[PDB]
C-alpha cells in the first residue's frame, strides 16, 4: 500500500481539502499514484471530483497533466468525463494535450461526447480536438454521441 | 443599521463556502437573513452565485427560500444562471425553484444565461420548461440578448 503521507494527499485531493494538500504536496509527492485503486494521481482525483482550488494549486506545484492512470487516462479525461468545464479549462491552459488517448484509444473528446457534455466538446474542439480520431473499436467521438444529443452531433458533424 | 455580527458571519461564510461556519450559524430564524448592507442577498443567493454546492445543499435542507428576492428582484436561481453554475441551478430547480420568475426589470433566469452566453444553462432551463418568448422591460427576449459571435445559443433558443 501507499505511504500514509501519500494516502492522505490522494484522499485530500479527492476531498478538495486544499489546506491538507498544501501540507503534503512536495516535488516528490505531487505525482504519487494510488496503488490501491486505478493509479490515479492527486491531479486525477482533484480533476475528477471538481476540486478547483486543488487543481489550481497542484498545477502550480509540479502536477503532471501528462500522467496516466492504470487505464491510460490523463486528468483531462477525468474532467471531461464528468463535465467539469473550469477544471478542463485549467488543464488545457497548463498544456494538457487535447488529443491524448488512453489504452483503448479514447480521447477526451470521446469521453465528452459519450457523456453528452456540449460545452466541453466545444472547448476541446476550439483547442484542436480531432473529431475524426477513432478509438480501438473504430468509433469516432461522433459515433459515441447519444441519439439524440443532436446539438453535440451537429457540433461534431 | 447593519446586520448582527451573526447574520454577517453567516452571509460571509455562505459566500466563501465555509460549510462548518454555516452549520454553526444557520437556524430557522437566520437561514433567510438579508445582507442589508449590500444588495440584500440571502445566504442562498451568495452560495448560489459563488458556486458553493455543499453550502447550497445544506441551506436547502434547512429551509432556505428558493423564492427569496434580493434588492433587484433576483432569486438565487438568477445568480446561478448568470454565473453558469449548472449543478447549483439543477439543485435549486430540484428543490422547487420556479424557472420563469422575473426580477424588477422582468429579466428571467433564461435572459441571464442567454446574455451571459451560458449554453448548458440555457439548455438546462429550457429542458425544464423555461419560456424563450418572455420579454423584459425593454421588450427583449432571451434570444435578443444573445451576443453576436455566440451563434450556437441562438439556434438553441
Amino acid at each position: 500500500g501507499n505511504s500514509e503521507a501519500d494516502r492522505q494527499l490522494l484522499e485530500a485531493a479527492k476531498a478538495g481539502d486544499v489546506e491538507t494538500v498544501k501540507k503534503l504536496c512536495t516535488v516528490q509527492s505531487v505525482n504519487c499514484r494510488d496503488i490501491e485503486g486505478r493509479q490515479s494521481t492527486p491531479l486525477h482525483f482533484a480533476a475528477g471530483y471538481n476540486r478547483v482550488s486543488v487543481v489550481e494549486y497542484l498545477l502550480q506545484h509540479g502536477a503532471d497533466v501528462h500522467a496516466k492512470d492504470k487505464g491510460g487516462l490523463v486528468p483531462l479525461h477525468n474532467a471531461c468525463s464528468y463535465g467539469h468545464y473550469e477544471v478542463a479549462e485549467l488543464l488545457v491552459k497548463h498544456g494538457a494535450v487535447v488529443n491524448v488517448a488512453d489504452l483503448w484509444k479514447f480521447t477526451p473528446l470521446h469521453e465528452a461526447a459519450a457523456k453528452g457534455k456540449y460545452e466541453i466538446c466545444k472547448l476541446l474542439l476550439q483547442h484542436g480536438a480531432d473529431p475524426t480520431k477513432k478509438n480501438r473499436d473504430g468509433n469516432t467521438p461522433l459515433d459515441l454521441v447519444k441519439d439524440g444529443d443532436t446539438d453535440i452531433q451537429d457540433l461534431l458533424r | 443599521m447593519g446586520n448582527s455580527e451573526a447574520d454577517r458571519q453567516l452571509l460571509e461564510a455562505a459566500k466563501a463556502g465555509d460549510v462548518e461556519t454555516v452549520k454553526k450559524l444557520c437556524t430557522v430564524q437566520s437561514v433567510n437573513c438579508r445582507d442589508i448592507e449590500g444588495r440584500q442577498s440571502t445566504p442562498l443567493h451568495f452560495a448560489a452565485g459563488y458556486n458553493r454546492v455543499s453550502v447550497v445543499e445544506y441551506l436547502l435542507q434547512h429551509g432556505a427560500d428558493v423564492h427569496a428576492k434580493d434588492k433587484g428582484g433576483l432569486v438565487p436561481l438568477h445568480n446561478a444562471c448568470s454565473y453558469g453554475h449548472y449543478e447549483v441551478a439543477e439543485l435549486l430547480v430540484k428543490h422547487g425553484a420556479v424557472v420563469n420568475v422575473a426580477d424588477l426589470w422582468k429579466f428571467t433566469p433564461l435572459h441571464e444565461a442567454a446574455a451571459k452566453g451560458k449554453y448548458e444553462i440555457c439548455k438546462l432551463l429550457l429542458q425544464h420548461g423555461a419560456d424563450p418568448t418572455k420579454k423584459n422591460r425593454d421588450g427583449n427576449t432571451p434570444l435578443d440578448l444573445v451576443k453576436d459571435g455566440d451563434t450556437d445559443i441562438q439556434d438553441l433558443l
Binding site: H44, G48, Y49, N50, G71, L103 | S54
Partner: peptide, 12 residues
C-alpha cells in the same frame, strides 16, 4: 474492459 475514471459529475 474499460473502466470509469476516478471522479463524479456532481459535487452533491
Amino acid at each position: 474492459q474499460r473502466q470509469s475514471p476516478d471522479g463524479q459529475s456532481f459535487r452533491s
